[PDB]
Design a protein around this ligand. Structure first.
Ligand SMILES: CS[C@H]1C[C@H](CO)[C@H](O)[C@H](O)[C@H]1NC(C)=O
Ligand SMILES: CS[C@H]1C[C@H](CO)[C@H](O)[C@H](O)[C@H]1NC(C)=O
Ligand SMILES: [Ca+2]
Ligand SMILES: [Ca+2]
Ligand SMILES: [Ca+2]
Ligand SMILES: [Ca+2]
Ligand SMILES: [Ca+2]
Ligand SMILES: [Ca+2]
Ligand SMILES: [Cl-]
Ligand SMILES: [Cl-]
Ligand SMILES: [Cl-]
Ligand SMILES: [Cl-]
Ligand SMILES: [Cl-]
Ligand SMILES: [Cl-]
Ligand SMILES: [Cl-]
Ligand SMILES: [Cl-]
Ligand SMILES: [Cl-]
Ligand SMILES: [Cl-]
Ligand SMILES: [Cl-]
Ligand SMILES: [Cl-]
Ligand SMILES: [Cl-]
Lengths: 129, 129
Protein backbone atom coordinates (compact mmCIF):
# COMPACT_ATOMS: atom_id res chain seq x y z
CA UNK A 1 0.00 0.00 0.00
CA UNK A 2 2.46 2.72 1.32
CA UNK A 3 5.78 3.28 -0.51
CA UNK A 4 9.08 2.04 1.04
CA UNK A 5 10.26 4.19 4.06
CA UNK A 6 6.58 5.22 4.76
CA UNK A 7 4.44 3.89 7.65
CA UNK A 8 0.73 2.93 7.20
CA UNK A 9 -1.81 3.91 9.94
CA UNK A 10 -5.69 4.23 9.53
CA UNK A 11 -5.84 5.22 5.78
CA UNK A 12 -2.76 7.51 5.85
CA UNK A 13 0.95 7.00 5.01
CA UNK A 14 3.53 8.80 7.22
CA UNK A 15 7.21 9.66 6.64
CA UNK A 16 9.22 10.84 9.71
CA UNK A 17 12.40 12.91 9.02
CA UNK A 18 15.90 11.98 10.38
CA UNK A 19 16.88 15.64 9.73
CA UNK A 20 15.77 19.27 10.27
CA UNK A 21 14.44 22.05 7.98
CA UNK A 22 12.52 25.36 8.27
CA UNK A 23 8.73 24.97 8.16
CA UNK A 24 8.62 26.26 4.51
CA UNK A 25 11.40 23.85 3.29
CA UNK A 26 9.65 20.97 5.14
CA UNK A 27 6.26 21.79 3.43
CA UNK A 28 8.09 21.97 0.00
CA UNK A 29 9.75 18.58 0.69
CA UNK A 30 6.32 16.97 1.55
CA UNK A 31 4.70 18.63 -1.54
CA UNK A 32 7.44 17.17 -3.86
CA UNK A 33 6.46 13.68 -2.44
CA UNK A 34 2.75 14.41 -3.30
CA UNK A 35 2.08 14.76 0.45
CA UNK A 36 1.61 17.49 3.09
CA UNK A 37 3.00 18.29 6.56
CA UNK A 38 1.00 16.04 8.98
CA UNK A 39 -2.53 17.30 9.88
CA UNK A 40 -3.70 15.92 13.30
CA UNK A 41 -7.46 15.10 12.93
CA UNK A 42 -7.97 12.99 16.15
CA UNK A 43 -6.62 11.90 19.59
CA UNK A 44 -5.84 8.48 17.97
CA UNK A 45 -3.69 10.05 15.18
CA UNK A 46 -2.00 12.28 17.89
CA UNK A 47 -1.12 9.14 19.98
CA UNK A 48 0.29 7.30 16.91
CA UNK A 49 2.47 10.27 15.79
CA UNK A 50 3.70 11.21 19.32
CA UNK A 51 4.88 7.60 20.06
CA UNK A 52 7.17 7.63 16.89
CA UNK A 53 8.61 11.15 17.38
CA UNK A 54 12.46 11.10 17.20
CA UNK A 55 12.92 12.78 20.66
CA UNK A 56 13.12 16.32 19.14
CA UNK A 57 10.90 19.32 18.16
CA UNK A 58 8.93 18.23 15.05
CA UNK A 59 6.95 20.44 12.61
CA UNK A 60 3.26 19.67 11.82
CA UNK A 61 1.18 21.33 9.06
CA UNK A 62 -0.32 24.13 11.24
CA UNK A 63 0.50 27.87 10.85
CA UNK A 64 -1.04 31.38 11.45
CA UNK A 65 1.12 33.77 9.30
CA UNK A 66 -2.11 35.60 8.17
CA UNK A 67 -3.49 35.99 11.76
CA UNK A 68 -5.71 32.82 12.11
CA UNK A 69 -4.49 29.17 12.67
CA UNK A 70 -4.81 27.00 9.49
CA UNK A 71 -4.00 23.34 8.63
CA UNK A 72 -2.14 22.96 5.26
CA UNK A 73 -4.95 20.78 3.73
CA UNK A 74 -7.86 23.05 4.94
CA UNK A 75 -9.08 20.90 7.92
CA UNK A 76 -10.98 23.42 10.17
CA UNK A 77 -8.82 24.49 13.15
CA UNK A 78 -11.45 25.89 15.57
CA UNK A 79 -13.70 22.72 15.56
CA UNK A 80 -10.71 20.31 15.09
CA UNK A 81 -8.41 18.48 17.52
CA UNK A 82 -6.11 20.72 19.64
CA UNK A 83 -3.22 19.65 21.94
CA UNK A 84 -1.34 22.85 22.99
CA UNK A 85 1.23 23.05 25.81
CA UNK A 86 0.05 25.12 28.84
CA UNK A 87 0.44 28.84 27.86
CA UNK A 88 0.54 28.11 24.06
CA UNK A 89 -0.03 29.40 21.54
CA UNK A 90 1.52 32.78 22.70
CA UNK A 91 2.96 34.36 19.44
CA UNK A 92 6.12 35.19 21.60
CA UNK A 93 8.41 38.03 20.31
CA UNK A 94 11.07 37.82 23.10
CA UNK A 95 13.34 35.61 20.89
CA UNK A 96 14.23 39.01 19.23
CA UNK A 97 14.45 37.30 15.77
CA UNK A 98 11.63 39.55 14.40
CA UNK A 99 7.83 38.97 14.41
CA UNK A 100 6.06 36.45 16.73
CA UNK A 101 5.67 32.66 16.27
CA UNK A 102 3.62 31.40 13.26
CA UNK A 103 4.45 27.62 13.00
CA UNK A 104 3.40 24.73 15.31
CA UNK A 105 5.57 21.80 16.37
CA UNK A 106 5.41 18.81 18.71
CA UNK A 107 7.38 18.65 21.94
CA UNK A 108 8.56 15.07 22.69
CA UNK A 109 5.47 14.53 25.00
CA UNK A 110 3.33 15.39 21.88
CA UNK A 111 1.99 18.74 23.21
CA UNK A 112 2.09 21.63 20.68
CA UNK A 113 4.01 24.97 20.77
CA UNK A 114 4.09 27.90 18.28
CA UNK A 115 7.69 28.77 17.24
CA UNK A 116 9.73 30.68 14.62
CA UNK A 117 9.15 29.09 11.17
CA UNK A 118 12.85 29.52 10.15
CA UNK A 119 14.02 27.06 12.92
CA UNK A 120 15.42 23.74 11.57
CA UNK A 121 13.19 21.04 13.20
CA UNK A 122 12.25 17.41 12.30
CA UNK A 123 9.01 16.95 10.33
CA UNK A 124 6.28 14.38 9.42
CA UNK A 125 4.71 14.06 5.93
CA UNK A 126 1.18 12.52 5.59
CA UNK A 127 -0.45 11.20 2.32
CA UNK A 128 -3.50 9.04 1.38
CA UNK A 129 -3.13 5.28 0.54
CA UNK B 1 30.65 58.69 4.78
CA UNK B 2 28.54 55.59 5.84
CA UNK B 3 24.82 55.46 4.91
CA UNK B 4 22.13 56.04 7.60
CA UNK B 5 21.73 53.04 10.04
CA UNK B 6 25.41 52.01 9.36
CA UNK B 7 28.31 52.51 11.83
CA UNK B 8 31.79 53.71 10.68
CA UNK B 9 34.94 52.07 12.21
CA UNK B 10 38.54 52.06 10.68
CA UNK B 11 37.62 52.23 6.92
CA UNK B 12 34.58 49.90 7.13
CA UNK B 13 30.81 50.48 7.52
CA UNK B 14 28.86 47.99 9.71
CA UNK B 15 25.13 47.19 9.94
CA UNK B 16 23.99 45.06 12.94
CA UNK B 17 20.65 43.16 12.55
CA UNK B 18 17.70 43.49 15.04
CA UNK B 19 16.43 40.15 13.61
CA UNK B 20 17.48 36.57 12.72
CA UNK B 21 18.01 34.67 9.44
CA UNK B 22 19.80 31.51 8.19
CA UNK B 23 23.43 32.07 7.17
CA UNK B 24 22.48 31.94 3.42
CA UNK B 25 19.58 34.48 3.78
CA UNK B 26 21.89 36.75 5.85
CA UNK B 27 24.65 36.62 3.12
CA UNK B 28 21.94 37.39 0.43
CA UNK B 29 20.68 40.35 2.53
CA UNK B 30 24.28 41.77 2.86
CA UNK B 31 24.92 41.19 -0.91
CA UNK B 32 21.72 43.15 -1.85
CA UNK B 33 23.19 46.10 0.23
CA UNK B 34 26.50 45.82 -1.79
CA UNK B 35 28.15 44.39 1.36
CA UNK B 36 29.21 41.02 2.83
CA UNK B 37 28.79 39.16 6.14
CA UNK B 38 31.46 40.67 8.47
CA UNK B 39 35.05 39.35 7.96
CA UNK B 40 37.17 39.70 11.18
CA UNK B 41 40.71 40.75 10.06
CA UNK B 42 42.17 41.82 13.50
CA UNK B 43 41.86 41.78 17.34
CA UNK B 44 40.81 45.49 17.09
CA UNK B 45 37.91 44.73 14.65
CA UNK B 46 36.94 41.72 16.93
CA UNK B 47 36.79 44.06 20.01
CA UNK B 48 34.68 46.67 18.14
CA UNK B 49 32.16 44.08 16.82
CA UNK B 50 31.89 42.08 20.11
CA UNK B 51 31.12 45.25 22.19
CA UNK B 52 28.05 46.07 19.90
CA UNK B 53 26.65 42.50 19.69
CA UNK B 54 22.91 42.44 20.60
CA UNK B 55 23.34 39.79 23.38
CA UNK B 56 22.57 36.86 20.99
CA UNK B 57 24.31 34.39 18.59
CA UNK B 58 25.40 36.43 15.54
CA UNK B 59 26.54 35.14 12.10
CA UNK B 60 29.91 36.27 10.60
CA UNK B 61 31.09 35.59 7.02
CA UNK B 62 33.00 32.34 7.76
CA UNK B 63 31.95 28.86 6.52
CA UNK B 64 33.44 25.40 5.60
CA UNK B 65 30.68 23.66 3.51
CA UNK B 66 33.39 22.39 1.05
CA UNK B 67 35.69 21.01 3.84
CA UNK B 68 38.05 24.03 4.50
CA UNK B 69 37.19 27.28 6.43
CA UNK B 70 36.72 30.31 4.08
CA UNK B 71 35.86 34.03 4.61
CA UNK B 72 33.17 35.32 2.15
CA UNK B 73 35.55 37.98 0.63
CA UNK B 74 38.57 35.57 0.27
CA UNK B 75 40.66 36.78 3.30
CA UNK B 76 42.99 33.79 4.09
CA UNK B 77 41.67 31.79 7.09
CA UNK B 78 44.81 29.84 8.17
CA UNK B 79 47.10 32.97 8.49
CA UNK B 80 44.20 35.27 9.59
CA UNK B 81 42.73 36.20 12.99
CA UNK B 82 41.00 33.33 14.88
CA UNK B 83 38.90 33.54 18.09
CA UNK B 84 37.25 30.09 18.61
CA UNK B 85 35.54 28.96 21.83
CA UNK B 86 37.41 26.13 23.67
CA UNK B 87 36.61 22.85 21.77
CA UNK B 88 35.51 24.68 18.54
CA UNK B 89 35.32 24.23 15.69
CA UNK B 90 34.00 20.59 16.17
CA UNK B 91 31.66 20.00 13.11
CA UNK B 92 29.17 18.43 15.70
CA UNK B 93 26.50 16.01 14.29
CA UNK B 94 24.71 15.26 17.63
CA UNK B 95 22.02 17.93 16.89
CA UNK B 96 20.57 15.14 14.61
CA UNK B 97 19.49 17.80 12.01
CA UNK B 98 21.73 16.18 9.32
CA UNK B 99 25.41 16.90 8.47
CA UNK B 100 27.84 18.68 10.86
CA UNK B 101 28.26 22.46 11.45
CA UNK B 102 29.46 24.64 8.52
CA UNK B 103 28.75 28.28 9.64
CA UNK B 104 30.51 30.39 12.33
CA UNK B 105 28.85 32.78 14.76
CA UNK B 106 29.76 34.93 17.75
CA UNK B 107 28.76 34.05 21.29
CA UNK B 108 27.98 37.18 23.37
CA UNK B 109 31.61 37.14 24.80
CA UNK B 110 32.77 37.34 21.11
CA UNK B 111 34.28 33.80 20.95
CA UNK B 112 33.37 31.80 17.81
CA UNK B 113 31.41 28.51 17.41
CA UNK B 114 30.53 26.45 14.28
CA UNK B 115 26.75 25.78 14.05
CA UNK B 116 23.99 24.66 11.65
CA UNK B 117 23.67 27.23 8.81
CA UNK B 118 19.82 26.96 8.76
CA UNK B 119 19.56 28.44 12.34
CA UNK B 120 17.98 31.95 12.49
CA UNK B 121 20.69 34.13 14.17
CA UNK B 122 21.50 37.89 14.17
CA UNK B 123 24.09 39.06 11.62
CA UNK B 124 26.57 41.90 10.82
CA UNK B 125 27.15 43.31 7.29
CA UNK B 126 30.51 45.03 6.47
CA UNK B 127 31.24 47.33 3.43
CA UNK B 128 34.01 49.81 2.39
CA UNK B 129 33.58 53.62 2.84
C1 LIG C 1 11.73 29.53 26.63
S1 LIG C 1 11.06 29.02 25.00
C2 LIG C 1 9.29 28.45 25.11
C3 LIG C 1 8.40 29.40 25.90
C4 LIG C 1 8.33 30.73 25.15
C5 LIG C 1 7.55 31.75 26.02
O1 LIG C 1 8.26 31.93 27.23
C6 LIG C 1 7.75 30.61 23.72
O2 LIG C 1 6.37 30.27 23.62
C7 LIG C 1 8.46 29.55 22.87
O3 LIG C 1 7.59 29.34 21.76
C8 LIG C 1 8.66 28.27 23.69
N1 LIG C 1 9.60 27.41 23.01
C9 LIG C 1 9.40 25.98 23.01
C10 LIG C 1 10.42 25.14 22.25
O4 LIG C 1 8.44 25.49 23.54
C1 LIG D 1 25.39 22.09 23.52
S1 LIG D 1 25.62 23.08 22.00
C2 LIG D 1 27.37 23.67 21.79
C3 LIG D 1 28.40 22.57 21.98
C4 LIG D 1 28.21 21.53 20.88
C5 LIG D 1 29.15 20.33 21.15
O1 LIG D 1 28.79 19.77 22.40
C6 LIG D 1 28.38 22.09 19.45
O2 LIG D 1 29.69 22.51 19.08
C7 LIG D 1 27.51 23.32 19.18
O3 LIG D 1 28.05 23.90 17.99
C8 LIG D 1 27.59 24.29 20.37
N1 LIG D 1 26.54 25.28 20.26
C9 LIG D 1 26.80 26.65 20.64
C10 LIG D 1 25.64 27.63 20.47
O4 LIG D 1 27.89 27.00 21.00
CA1 LIG E 1 -4.21 13.31 9.44
CA1 LIG F 1 1.39 33.59 15.33
CA1 LIG G 1 5.23 29.64 21.68
CA1 LIG H 1 36.71 43.36 8.29
CA1 LIG I 1 32.08 22.02 9.15
CA1 LIG J 1 30.28 23.73 17.18
CL1 LIG K 1 15.82 12.85 6.70
CL1 LIG L 1 -7.10 31.24 15.07
CL1 LIG M 1 -5.39 22.28 23.64
CL1 LIG N 1 5.69 38.65 23.30
CL1 LIG O 1 7.85 17.35 26.42
CL1 LIG P 1 7.37 32.79 12.53
CL1 LIG Q 1 16.73 43.77 11.39
CL1 LIG R 1 40.26 24.70 7.30
CL1 LIG S 1 41.34 30.62 18.27
CL1 LIG T 1 29.90 14.63 16.11
CL1 LIG U 1 29.58 33.93 25.91
CL1 LIG V 1 25.60 23.37 8.46
CL1 LIG W 1 17.26 27.23 15.96
Amino acid sequence: SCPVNWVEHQDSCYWFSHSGMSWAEAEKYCQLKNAHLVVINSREEQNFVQKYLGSAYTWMGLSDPEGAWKWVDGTDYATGFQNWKPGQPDDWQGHGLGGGEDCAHFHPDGRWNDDVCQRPYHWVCEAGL
